[PDB]
């Protein structure tokens, strides 16, 4: 059906246009190489001039949704498109006698007009069609010219003078044209030029030459017009136009050095067999040495000897209390020493912390997770994105739900630019999604329910349309749970 867009029988072409129109709704914003109806725009230029009125109209509504699927980045190739496309669109789409064939052709031109920086290049291409045999075409494409103006207008136009002359030139003949419609719809185009910089200018250039009855109707039309001589705000904006004092940090404060604080009876106390030795040792350097300070020394201070013994306990120490007071120490370092834990520090405690999410005691999960949040807010997503996934795949039920909740926490604070091709997208479908589904399809409900948020916090970040592929493979029953959180969840 791909190459059948040019098949001989009409009803097989009619398919390909519907197939395409689906493709441009249902395919990727970033976009498949299969979406190559940009770098050969001769294709759709052909399709718009289909030798069959029914399969033509279906090609135009495929072009239409294509031509709005392309309001995603980067498609600076809209210059080539207007050249290739609007002459076929004007010549035989606006021309059409068919209600819907015409309406969508105009809408298409609209979307090509706002692809552009201004209106001139589109205007300049569809001007010649005013001089065509068929009246209903000049009847129509003067209406289309007049409403690319009333909704956009002249802005970011290099040489407006040259453009005004070029569109004012035919207006005498158009207003003396035989067809009633060509005339009636030319007075509208006059008004839409007056509506923007009339009437002193138009009476010097064009009012003089028209039938007296005509310039009366134009004046009657200007009274009924209310609103400032140039319109204050345009009813429609272009591409770039639509998107269209620093704050201080308290971190400037002097640093404090804690190496000098430590006691001689520390190393044997933390590496002791008596639990209370270890606890007191940790608890002292925490309450006496870390908790007071508010900024540690960035310059020339190696904590990766101290931090690797916090890990040794957080991972392996059998005393849940000594874990709790250690992960709170780890957090204090990551908090009072922002921008330190680049790799060696962050990575020295990361995989131990993820192992110990196994702990279910509320106070301990509080401390471990909050420390994981510290290492994340100053190293996200350096090592954690990968290793967090690893431990979602882990056998302990608790580490699954907690490390997945971790990805959820991190994903809500995912604000890294950009704007595209970040570490999240490089591994999105390959790893993140394949691993989040393993949570979504877990044996336990409380596990599954964490996946349901962690998938609805994912869609929120990366478009509920991009992930509609594995959404389909999922149960209709799990789907409405996922959607439940999508409606509540924020980043």
């Amino acid at each position: 059906l791909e190459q059948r867009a040019s098949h001989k029988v009409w009803k097989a072409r009619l398919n390909a246009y519907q197939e395409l129109n689906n493709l441009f709704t249902k395919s990727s914003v970033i976009p498949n190489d299969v979406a190559n109806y940009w770098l050969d725009p001769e294709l759709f230029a052909s399709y718009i001039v289909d030798s069959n009125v029914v399969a033509q109209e279906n090609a135009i509504i495929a072009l239409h949704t294509l031509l709005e699927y392309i309001s995603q980045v980067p498609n600076v190739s809209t210059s080539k498109l207007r050249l290739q496309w609007i002459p076929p669109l004007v010549e035989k789409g606006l021309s059409s006698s068919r209600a819907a064939t015409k309406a969508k052709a105009t809408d298409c031109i609209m979307l090509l007009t706002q692809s552009d920086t201004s209106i001139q290049q589109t205007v300049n291409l569809m001007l010649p069609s005013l001089s065509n045999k068929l009246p209903r075409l000049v009847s129509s494409c003067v209406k289309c010219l007049a409403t690319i103006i009333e909704e956009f207008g002249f802005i970011n136009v290099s040489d407006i003078n040259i453009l005004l002359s070029e569109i004012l030139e035919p207006l005498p003949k158009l207003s003396s044209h035989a067809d009633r419609n060509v005339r009636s719809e030319t007075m509208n185009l006059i008004l839409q030029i007056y509506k923007w910089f009339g009437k002193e200018l138009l009476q010097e250039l064009l009012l003089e030459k028209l039938k007296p009855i005509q310039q009366r109707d134009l004046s009657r039309m200007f009274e009924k017009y209310e609103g400032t001589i140039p319109p204050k705000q345009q009813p429609r904006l272009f591409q770039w136009a639509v998107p269209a004092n620093a704050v201080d940090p308290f971190e400037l404060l002097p640093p404090s050095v804690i190496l000098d604080k430590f006691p001689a009876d520390f190393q044997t106390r933390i590496s002791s067999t008596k639990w209370k030795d270890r606890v007191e040792a940790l608890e002292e350097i925490h309450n006496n040495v870390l908790k007071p300070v508010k900024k540690l020394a960035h310059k020339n201070q190696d904590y990766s000897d101290y931090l690797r013994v916090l890990a040794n306990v957080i991972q392996k120490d059998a005393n849940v209390q000594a874990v709790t007071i250690a992960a709170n120490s780890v957090q204090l370092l990551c908090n009072s020493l922002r921008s330190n834990f680049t790799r060696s520090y962050g990575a020295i405690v990361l995989v131990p912390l993820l192992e110990r999410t196994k702990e279910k005691k509320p106070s301990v999960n509080e401390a471990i997770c909050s420390a994981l949040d510290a290492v994340a807010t100053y190293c996200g997503f350096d090592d954690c994105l990968e290793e967090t996934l690893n431990y979602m795949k882990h056998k302990t039920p608790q580490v699954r739900i907690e490390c997945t909740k971790f990805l959820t926490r991190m994903l809500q604070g995912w604000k890294s630019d950009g704007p595209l091709q970040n570490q999240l997208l490089f591994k999105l479908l390959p790893e993140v999604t394949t691993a989040v589904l393993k949570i979504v399809n877990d044996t336990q409900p409380t596990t599954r329910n964490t996946g349901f948020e962690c998938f609805a916090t994912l869609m929120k970040l990366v478009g509920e349309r991009e992930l509609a592929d594995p959404l389909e493979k999922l149960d209709n029953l799990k789907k409405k749970k996922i959607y439940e959180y999508y409606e509540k969840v924020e980043v």
């Binding site: 606890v279 059998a318 005393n319 849940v320 302990t396 608790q398």
Partner: protein, 424 residues
Amino acid sequence: MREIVHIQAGQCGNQIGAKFWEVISDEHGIDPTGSYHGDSDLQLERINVYYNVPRAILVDLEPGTMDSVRSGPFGQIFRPDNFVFGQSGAGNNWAKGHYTEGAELVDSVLDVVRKESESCDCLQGFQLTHSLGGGTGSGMGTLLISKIREEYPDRIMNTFSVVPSPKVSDTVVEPYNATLSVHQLVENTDETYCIDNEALYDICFRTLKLTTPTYGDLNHLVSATMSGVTTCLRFPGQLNADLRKLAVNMVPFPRLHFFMPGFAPLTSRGSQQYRALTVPELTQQMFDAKNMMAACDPRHGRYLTVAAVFRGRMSMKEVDEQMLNVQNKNSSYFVEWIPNNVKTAVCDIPPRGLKMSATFIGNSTAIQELFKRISEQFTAMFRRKAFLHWYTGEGMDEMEFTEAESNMNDLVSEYQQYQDATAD
């Protein structure tokens, strides 16, 4: 679903634990040296469940208990490696068993648990015996359970937990310990047999007419109950065959998995009644609250599920009739919204010293009475804040007591809800 790993923790744990191994070693025809001197294949048909030599791990912070087991009758059979014991004791401090001293040892225990599980064709789950008013059996046991729960989440956890009563020890911190332990069991075990010392004393004192029951006297009732409830597991049989199927047909709501066990006939230490009971007599030891190992009145609540195990040669026709009888003649006591909630199974090999016997495992909402008693004693103690510095000193937070208090009360409320529920 074949092998079961057994654990015993604390003094009580190893006492009723060893007693259990004494009973079912005889029943299966194993001597203290570990050799088969039976005379039937129905004895070695499912010997692989509890034996390899027992698949039993012995645990206590109190090192003395080591010797009290090995110097016992079947003390020689247990694997020397499977003894894991600490230097000091917990001294009735749940926090010492759960957070400080008991936590230091728990790794060594898990190493042995792993070892025994490693060489299992297909593990079923685990089986822990312990007391709840202690420090080790409760604090370290519940910590062991959670530690297994997370290392073996694809397996069943089945406990024989004995409840403290003033009638057996006047230690007033036991309400604390048992409350904290119940806060664990409701979250960490699939099924728990509630052995109430209150009820064991009341049976030895009032029914067996022993003026001063010893532990041995109370332990006799326990070991006989355990062999009874594990009869399905240890011999060939269609119904309630493995641990998971049992729990599936016994536990309708995950938190309400506290069974009120009871069995018949009640005998003394080595006495014989010289007259074997009839099938209708055995059946009429179900509602008979003087046969419940938990101090609760089944009349004061409703049965959610019931498992009956008849042991001995008898009429399967008559047992069916009597059970079908006793259900509908007391129809208001069995929950209506669970149809066919009572299940009966027969084993031809009777227990030691009896021609016939019958064990009555029941998930009765009346069990809330038991948790009421524990909570009121806990609250009376906790409102005056007595002995809290013991627990808090070991790293515990005062908040924990409030949570365990509240969580047990939610457990009581839940039982009360389903008792007052209607099918309509």
